[PDB]
Every structure is written in structure tokens, then in C-alpha cells.
Design an enzyme around this catalytic site. Structure first.
Site, PDB file in Angstrom:
ATOM      1  N   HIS B  45     -13.989  42.874  56.684  1.00 28.50           N
ATOM      2  CA  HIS B  45     -13.030  42.298  55.748  1.00 28.50           C
ATOM      3  C   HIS B  45     -12.031  41.361  56.418  1.00 28.50           C
ATOM      4  CE1 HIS B  45     -10.642  45.930  57.010  1.00 28.50           C
ATOM      5  NE2 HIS B  45      -9.673  45.031  56.985  1.00 28.50           N
ATOM      6  N   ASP B  81     -18.194  47.976  57.106  1.00 32.14           N
ATOM      7  CA  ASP B  81     -17.017  47.188  57.466  1.00 32.14           C
ATOM      8  C   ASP B  81     -17.028  46.864  58.959  1.00 32.14           C
ATOM      9  OD1 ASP B  81     -13.439  47.416  56.631  1.00 32.14           O
ATOM     10  OD2 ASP B  81     -14.836  45.725  56.731  1.00 32.14           O
ATOM     11  N   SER B 162      -5.690  46.794  62.256  1.00 35.03           N
ATOM     12  CA  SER B 162      -7.028  46.870  61.686  1.00 35.03           C
ATOM     13  C   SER B 162      -7.981  45.973  62.463  1.00 35.03           C
ATOM     14  CB  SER B 162      -7.006  46.469  60.213  1.00 35.03           C
ATOM     15  OG  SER B 162      -8.278  46.654  59.617  1.00 35.03           O
TER      16      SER B 162
END
Lengths: 296, 296, 296
Positions: B45, B81, B162
Site C-alpha cells: 500500500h 501487503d 509502516s
């Protein structure tokens, strides 16, 4: 092995999963084995619907071994969010080591443990941020909203570790997690659970007052919203719009500390209630009634 | 120096900043150098829009030295992901030390590291709260929503860490942070990244079922909302309103664990699917198809 | 005793409760004793209403002993969320040990301490997650919204520890907590408090520009929304729709770092301002004015 990894594995066999299922609902929580005969302490909002709808809800306890044993409710206390469960004829139980919450201090490292086999099961770490902190809690179903005098921690208390133990670095239970994290002190849990095993219920003092919180320069504390009729309050002479500043030997900062202060009083003994009334400091005398006359 | 301060500085040269810019947009994330030839693992993402709109987005990697080197996408996996990037002809690369997530336990101290030169860059600390926890994730753009079997931590995973590494106390990567914090286990990241480097894509098993989560006393698990036509499911004999309780050798507690359970199966081999159908426990046999026939 | 339990108890006598009450309102916060003569550093939003409405608000300081001593405001800085208070003729004061925030690194263990006798008083633990991070803050009343260049921590900063100290493992104040937690660096607090004690006010550089944040492939930075008239900016030649990329010797990533960059400049000295204007990189020269001409 790590420090927290060792303390956690030591108590994992003392923490159990509590599930309550019906034909259309399923509720899960965590519990703590505090007695070798099968007594399991959890919080009241985990089992609430099973107690108010016992005809349709079934409670079972799941151990770290995966063993599923049926459970019966011994007693519950919505005012402390505490409940005692009983599994029957289970051997080799690893009983939790219960500690002393009066020996706990701010900065002490803690572990909030949930049942290892739980769905959203969590084990978080933090420190003790505050002691004797009144915190408001909501009642599960027809259950009453309450306030406990609590241990605050910066470790997260959530749905996955609620009802499980707050654990010190000696792997001793110092609190019962209740879902900026709060737990019920173990000294309170020992007193409440002892009465729920013996009598199946616990009796708390009542005064008949509703309070709203007020804070200004004239008088800060709990402002009386209503005085019930025939209550210990209206007999002792408390009127509306009174601002309570001390209940017994405990000062009252807001309505939440007022709820805790009433509940540490003795039933039947006269207690001094100091109030500020239109600028006049007035100390009054009230004898607290029991909330359950037939169980008292 | 502190314990966490030493472990963090040791891996700061292995964590890079990933930026994707256009004429009107700019996206930033964190990456991990896992190979000396220039292979950088991040999450999908962070780069999604650059992959779906490669004509207008430019991805560059920024190192701890401040060096800005262009980056090319090797491959991505929205279902985990995960994404692999390539910088070309860069020397003296500090490659991260990859560990083993099967050796990780609950209570282990961890560090969630973001790229030091990032805008909202963060380095948080916590412990491992849960292992093999299915967690739902949303797809960035046209990307699919997915569920990973994850490592849970009470350290905060946010926009600033992240795509960076989850790090043990030996300064080894045990997970890829993905933004109550969750990370992709490193053993999963090694398997997925190995296939994205070699083939530029990874193939996962598909059954053709949509599920909704159900939990009661009769049967708790994944309830079949739709069975696609010509799918492995409808050929094997799964009907609607079926409640899946085990896929292969893994029990299924809800729809989220069902997504993970299908994705650990083998493509082409027959697998047992146990279901509860109108009170009857029925075990069925299904052969999982590949989601990408031409890359299989 | 524990590590954090010892560091916390060592500074508990240096942290005080600050209350501001009126006939209808009451505000509470935390403060730090930084001088033996009675100087107490807190943040500006704790006392804001008492400064803007001094006629009706009364500020008192409550010590760890329970002692309540009246307090007078020496000076405040809304642009740094900092304020200096004075208690008069108080002896045996435990003064906090002030440290050096330039010696702080990422991963360092910290304690965010609130006043022990506070209502919602909290003591949280964490690490330093980021250094020199611009963070936006809201102004309490007529107070201006501002941006500080801050120390970020994964320890929680809340209403119960705001205004209290961020403490290292040597029990030294490295920051002032301001309520994903942020604190004002101590080197900034020493410079601001020194001027508030001496002059009762601090003067900051102003340029006369309003900025909005922009990030693309052509030019990322602070986009000029308005240039005030007669300001140092419009005299130096900054026009609207300009994208500032560096103020003085500090690059500017967004509008928040632009606010911090202007405020580290020297008043009266010429400073280089580099801007991107319709694809042309243009460096300009501006002399920053003082925000308070009569106190300068």
C-alpha cells in the site's frame, strides 16, 4: 529468554478463556484461577447476559491445554465488575499467585495478560501510572453503571485481556483488567470474591443520593442532584444543591470519588458527611443502609 | 547507551525512505534492504498508486546518508501487503539481518523502526502481544482488501514506521510493519519476496467462496455467502449457508481465519473441508485453483 | 525497587499541581520547579484563561506535601506553549535537574511525569521516537495556534502529565510535556524561560507570510498563501504562489517546518530565502522583523 516472556509463560496456565454462547450470540472473555477447587475470577460484564438470561446462555471455561469444561456462576458484583465462576472436578490446576496491591507503586512494570487461546487474545506491557484512581464503568445489560477505585496503567486493556490478570514482575496477580488502561486492585478482588464464594452475593452501603460534579473557587466536589425519600441521607439532613466535600474519612473531589467513598463506609455505623451549603460548611451525620436487606 | 538506542542505531542504515511523487500527489513510506544487490522490501500500500498508475508516478529510495537513488518495482502482492523494489548499482549496502518468526514468543521486546529521514518517521517500542493472529487490511486503490496471519504488538505501527522492520533485541528483522500494531512475519516475507524477485509475481490458492462470520452454540465459523460458478468449491459440493469449521488442517473461527486458511493450501492437491450444514457435520473434498493461471 | 519506580520518585518533589479557579470554572495542570527562588515552568495552555482573564481567575500551586501556595504569572509564550510562574518565600524546594536535549537520541527510555496529587494525574513510560519533529498545537483561548520543533515519544502525553517533565533514566528533565506524545525540548525551555524571568516576555522573528503545504514532483514545501503589506517578505520580493524550500540554513518540507524555521532566525540580520517560482529556483533576501517592537 526475555524478562516479560518468562513472567508471562509462568501465569499462562492460570489464565483461562470464558465463553458464553446462545442460539444467536457468543461472548468471550478472560478469567483467572484463584483457587484449587475450581474458582475462577473474571469481571461481571463478560458474563452479564448469561446471568440475566440464564435460560438461554451457556458458559464454558477453556484451559491452556484446550480442555473445555462447563462452568457455573457462583456470584457477581456489578458495582465492582467482578464475578466468580466454578468448574467442578478439575485436577492439577495451576492456581495464580495473588499479591498485595497496597505494595504497588507508580512506575512498577506490569503485564496485562489475556487467555492465550482467546480469539482477540492480547498480552500488553506497561507501568502503573496512578493508584486509587476512581474510574467510571458502564453496565453490560440491565447492569448498573459503576465507579471503581482503580490501578491505572499505560499498558493497553482491551477486549482480549479484560478479565485477565494484571501481573507484577514476580508473576503475581495485582489486579483484574477491566475494559489508558484500568484494573481492579487485588485486595478489593480478594474481599469481594471471598463473599461471593461464601454467600453468593456481597452487600454494599447505600445513602440514597445522586450527585453531579462541580468545581469552582467557592466549593469543589459532588453536588447533590436528588435525595431519595426515606433514605439515610434525607434522615441525616442532606438537602439538594449541597456540595459534598468529604464522606467519612475520605475527601470527595467529584461525583466519581463520591461513589467510591460511600462504598468504603460501614453499614449501620454513623458516619460524618461534610457539605458546603450556600457558603456555609456543615458537617452532617448519616447511617448507611445496606443495598440488599435480605442478604444482609 | 540504552538497550533500544543500540538496537535501533544498528539497523538504521538498513531502513530506507520510499517516496512516490507525481505532478499532484506524493506518497512516502519505509523500506528494508534485504539483499546486497539492491532489493528493498516494503508493503504494497506504500507503492500501490505507482504500480496502478506507472505512467505518472516516480518512485525513489532515500538512504540514511541522504542519497536519493531511483527505484524500479520488481513485484507486489496485495494479498500479503508486500512489495519488492530494486535500486541499481549501489555499493556498501548495509543489509538487514533477517530472523525467524517461528522462534518469536509472547512478551518478547520489539522495536518498530521507520526510516530515520522520513517526514513523520517514528521508532516505537513494545512487546509481542499475539502470534498467528488474522488481521483484516484495506487495499490502497484498486487493490484488494486482504487478511494476513500476523504478529501483534503493543508498539504503535503508524504511517511513520509502516513498511519498516519489526526488530528483536538481537537487531534482527522478525516482521514488516503494516499500518494495536500488526506486522507481517518474516518467514512469510522471505517466501513471498523470493518469488517476487524470481518470477515478478506470486500465485495463491483460490476456492471461489465468500464468507461471513458466525458464532453461536450450534456452529461457529465462516458462513458461506456465495459459491462462485465453476469454482473448486461448487465442484467439490459446498452449498450456500454452509458453516466452514476447518480448511485443510487448520480450524476456522471466523471469515478472517478462513481467508488465511485457504491461502496456506496447496494448489492442485485435494484438501478436506469440514462444514456444518443444517446440523449435520459434513466433510468435503476440494482442489484449490490458482489465482493466476498464466503465471502458474 | 524498579528502574522507573526509582527515577519517578526522585523527581516527584520537583513536579507540582497548578490549578486556576473562578466562580464558574476550574483548570488543572502540572508544573516543574526549575529554580530555588520559586520559578515554575509549565505550558501556556494550562494557564491561558487566567492570563487573558486575570480579574476573575486565581492560580495556586500545590506541592507533593499537599501545601497550597498562591502563584503569580511571570510570563508566557503561546508560540512555544511555555509559561513561568512564581511562588514567593517557599523553602527547602527540590529543584529539578535540567538536562541537555541535544544529547538525547532515538530509542532512549523516558518517563512522562505528572503531578502526583493531580486529579487525572498520570505517569507514563516510553522511548524517544523522533527528534526535531515539527508538531502543530492549538491555542487555548484567544491564544494563537503554533508549531514547535519537538521531541516525539511513544509514551502517552495526556491531560494528567501535560506541563510536567519528560525525564531520562538519570532523572533529568529533557522536555516539557505538551498535550503519539510530544514535548518541548529542554534547551528551548531554558532559553524561553530565561527571557520570561528577566523581561517578562520573549520576542520572536516575523516575516509576514501565510503558507499552505504542498508536495509534488516539481517542488515540495510551503506554498505562500498571502504576503502581508509592509512586511519583511514583500519588501524582500516574495510573491504569492511561491513555494519556499529553505529558510536560512534550514530546508522546509511543509508549512509546519516553515513556522519553526522562521522562528530560529535572527531579528534584523539578512537571511536567504530560497523559493521555487513557476519552475524557476529563486533565492531571495529578507530581514526578519520582531513580533513585539516595544519589547525588543
Amino acid at each position: 529468554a526475555g524478562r516479560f516472556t518468562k513472567v508471562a509463560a509462568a501465569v499462562a496456565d492460570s489464565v483461562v478463556t470464558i465463553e458464553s454462547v446462545s442460539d444467536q450470540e457468543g461472548m468471550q472473555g478472560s478469567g483467572v484461577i484463584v483457587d484449587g477447587r475450581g474458582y475462577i475470577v473474571t469481571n461481571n460484564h463478560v458474563i452479564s447476559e448469561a446471568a440475566n438470561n440464564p435460560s438461554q446462555f451457556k458458559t464454558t471455561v477453556v484451559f491452556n491445554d484446550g480442555k473445555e469444561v462447563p462452568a457455573n456462576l457462583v456470584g457477581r458484583d456489578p458495582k465492582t465488575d467482578l464475578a466468580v465462576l466454578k468448574v467442578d472436578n478439575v485436577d492439577n490446576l495451576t492456581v495464580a499467585r495473588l499479591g498485595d496491591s497496597s505494595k504497588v507503586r507508580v512506575g512498577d512494570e506490569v503485564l496485562a495478560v489475556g487467555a492465550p487461546l482467546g480469539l482477540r487474545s492480547t498480552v500488553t506491557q506497561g507501568i502503573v501510572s496512578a493508584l486509587h484512581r476512581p474510574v467510571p464503568l458502564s453496565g453490560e445489560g440491565s447492569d448498573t453503571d459503576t465507579v471503581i477505585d482503580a490501578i491505572q496503567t499505560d499498558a493497553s486493556i482491551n477486549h482480549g485481556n479484560s478479565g485477565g490478570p494484571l501481573i507484577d514482575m514476580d508473576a503475581q496477580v495485582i489486579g483484574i483488567n477491566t475494559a489508558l488502561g484500568f484494573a481492579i486492585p487485588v485486595n478489593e478482588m480478594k474481599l469481594v470474591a471471598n463473599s461471593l464464594i461464601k454467600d453468593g452475593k456481597i452487600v454494599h452501603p447505600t445513602l440514597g443520593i445522586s450527585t453531579r460534579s462541580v468545581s469552582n473557587a467557592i466549593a469543589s466536589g459532588a453536588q447533590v442532584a436528588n435525595v431519595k425519600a426515606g433514605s439515610p441521607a434525607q434522615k441525616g439532613g442532606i438537602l439538594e444543591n449541597d456540595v459534598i466535600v468529604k464522606v467519612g474519612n475520605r475527601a470527595v473531589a467529584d461525583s466519581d470519588e463520591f461513589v467510591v467513598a460511600v462504598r468504603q463506609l460501614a453499614i449501620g455505623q454513623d458516619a460524618p458527611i461534610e457539605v458546603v451549603r450556600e457558603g456555609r460548611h456543615v458537617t452532617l451525620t448519616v447511617k448507611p443502609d445496606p443495598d440488599s436487606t435480605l442478604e444482609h
